[PDB]
Design a protein around this ligand. Sequence first.
Ligand SMILES: Oc1c(F)cc(-c2cnccc2-c2ccc(N3CCOCC3)cc2)cc1F
Length: 289
Amino acid sequence: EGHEKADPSQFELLKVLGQGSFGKVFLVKKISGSDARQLYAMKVLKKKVRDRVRTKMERDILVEVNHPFIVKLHYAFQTEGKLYLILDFLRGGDLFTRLSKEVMFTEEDVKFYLAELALALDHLHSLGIIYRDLKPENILLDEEGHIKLTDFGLSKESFCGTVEYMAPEVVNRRGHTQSADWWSFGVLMFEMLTGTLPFQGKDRKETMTMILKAKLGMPQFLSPEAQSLLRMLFKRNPANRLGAGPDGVEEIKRHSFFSTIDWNKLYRREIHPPFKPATGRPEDTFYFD
Ligand SMILES: Oc1c(F)cc(-c2cnccc2-c2ccc(N3CCOCC3)cc2)cc1F
């Protein structure tokens, strides 16, 4: 079932990439079909979630999601109390990891990732999907340098998550509109530029409290544009935030900050990424001569 029909005997398990509460990730290689020898990430989850006296696989949200800068569910299948999602395998690492090293990114490097993330978030909003936990660990990089949002945070719009990226209405549990996603957009931006989270205290309590009332002082090494965008993104009324309006994402798009960005070339991955990441493949690991 899923996006394409497939079974266990059509995949070859190579590694376990990681393991969490959600389930367990594998590196796998397709053995059948036209894409034989194509590497994938196999996410397998313990079948838990269920409603209306039927086990509802709410990883049916990836069916309609198809976009350059988002992960695509290639195949899917359930098997003896486990659901198996096959997704894109990205070998550039997180954007968290690069942040941990570089500390802060050039305004042009940030402009890039945000712009591609903007397109991603718009696509999801066009399907009525919101990204709960928009932290930097969810934004993976491909070997080119372009991004890909993971599916972990996906959820229909109609409590938990890293509190720093959470928006004020979400803290008060007033509902997770798509305006919340643009707040986290603001956080990711502030963080990538300052190497620091805009709201953070001694504990999760104080941090949440600060999100609600604590006035933020703009770091004055940020350009007028970057400041402008942040000030607009960080508004505690969701309806007054940038993005939450008639135009939608065009508000974000037509801003001084992105005034260098060719959104058509960006989409077609024709604009060059700022940083090419390292890969596990022998090309990037070996020494030479
Ligand atoms: O749902 C997805 C998935 F399961 C995997 C990947 C993915 C694709 N290429 C390379 C690495 C990964 C990847 C590997 C491990 C993790 N984690 C470790 C365990 O706790 C959760 C986080 C996350 C991502 C992408 C997805 F969207």
